Amino acid sequence: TTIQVIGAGLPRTGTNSMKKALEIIYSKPCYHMYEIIFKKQSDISIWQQLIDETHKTTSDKRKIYNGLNELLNGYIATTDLPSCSFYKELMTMYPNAKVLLTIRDKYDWLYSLRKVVLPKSTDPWKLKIEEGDQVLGIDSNFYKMSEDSLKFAFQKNHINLDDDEILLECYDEYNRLVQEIVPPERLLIHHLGDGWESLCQFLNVDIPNGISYPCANSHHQMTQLTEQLIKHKSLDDIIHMFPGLI
Numbered sequence: 001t002t003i004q005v006i007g008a009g010l011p012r013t014g015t016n017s018m019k020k021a022l023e024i025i026y027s028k029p030c031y032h033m034y035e036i037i038f039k040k041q042s043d044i045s046i047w048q049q050l051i052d053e054t055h056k057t058t059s060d061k062r063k064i065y066n067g068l069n070e071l072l073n074g075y076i077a078t079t080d081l082p083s084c085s086f087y088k089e090l091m092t093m094y095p096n097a098k099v100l101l102t103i104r105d106k107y108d109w110l111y112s113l114r115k116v117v118l119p120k121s122t123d124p125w126k127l128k129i130e131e132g133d134q135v136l137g138i139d140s141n142f143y144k145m146s147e148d149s150l151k152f153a154f155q156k157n158h159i160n161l162d163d164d165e166i167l168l169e170c171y172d173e174y175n176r177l178v179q180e181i182v183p184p185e186r187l188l189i190h191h192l193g194d195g196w197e198s199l200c201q202f203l204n205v206d207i208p209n210g211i212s213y214p215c216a217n218s219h220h221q222m223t224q225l226t227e228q229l230i231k232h233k234s235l236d237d238i239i240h241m242f243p244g245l246i
């Protein structure tokens with residue numbers, strides 16, 4: 001198994017649905033942030049060392065390639081952070097892998113990000129996310145790795161993440177840079193709601209007969225998940241309420 005598709009889209013642009021869509025097409029697993037959170041939290045420290053390596057004055061690219069290969073062993077595709085921040089490196093390791101850029105309205109994206117991924121430091125909901133994540137075993141190590149991977153994607157060392165305006169422009173610039181960096185034939189821009197048609201054509205497969213395009217991971221469902229984790233203090237006791245998520 002080798003990487004066939006590199007998902008460059010940022011969190012909250014439909015990466016989980018694209019993960020599930022690629023798993024349907026290929027019948028093999030696709031990486032995602034939820035693979036880390038719910039299945040392999042030991043990957044956190046690996047991603048952290050890879051991101052740190054990029055910050056050095058002289059970066060060892062083969063250390064980065066080796067780490068990515070270990071992390072993605074057994075996977076047919078990647079989506080979401082932290083992997084999307086390494087799309088240039090994954091394109092080079094896998095020159096025949098195609099690139100998908102999931103994209104959506106920038107203002108819908110910011111709202112979704114503030115609800116699930118990156119609340120402002122002054123938002124009291126931030127404390128609820130953290131309390132729910134604690135039930136899952138997620139701690140400060142994860143938040144540092146995830147934040148560092150977002151900053152790496154945005155190619156900034158210092159960033160005021162509480163500034164909505166700076167996030168909007170980093171979002172536009174990132175999506176613009178992907179389309180500049182990736183050769184046109186090697187890239188599909190998949191807008192939210194685009195469904196099977198353009199994706200299957202791009203990947204040279206047929207549209208899955210009788211299987212609807214996934215619609216997973218809404219901020220409404222994530223808000224409920226956080227609340228049920230806080231209430232019941234157990235993922236196992238609540239997962240029956242969240243089918244088709246993890």
Ligand SMILES: Nc1ncnc2c1ncn2[C@@H]1O[C@H](COP(=O)(O)O)[C@@H](OP(=O)(O)O)[C@H]1O
Nearest residue numbers: 011012013014015016017112215216217218219
């Ligand atoms: N098939 C689909 N059609 C429309 N929106 C979708 C979708 N699949 C996922 N989404 C939206 O994409 C966002 C999740 O993206 P990601 O998996 O990268 O975190 C959610 O947005 P909202 O938070 O606005 O509901 C979710 O509703």
Ligand SMILES: CC(C)NC[C@H]1CCc2cc(CO)c([N+](=O)[O-])cc2N1
Nearest residue numbers: 011081116117118133143146147150
């Ligand atoms: C899945 C839910 C329950 N856990 C919340 C996670 C959700 C995943 C997540 C992702 C990032 C970056 O992609 C950051 N971040 O910007 O530090 C935080 C988080 N928090």
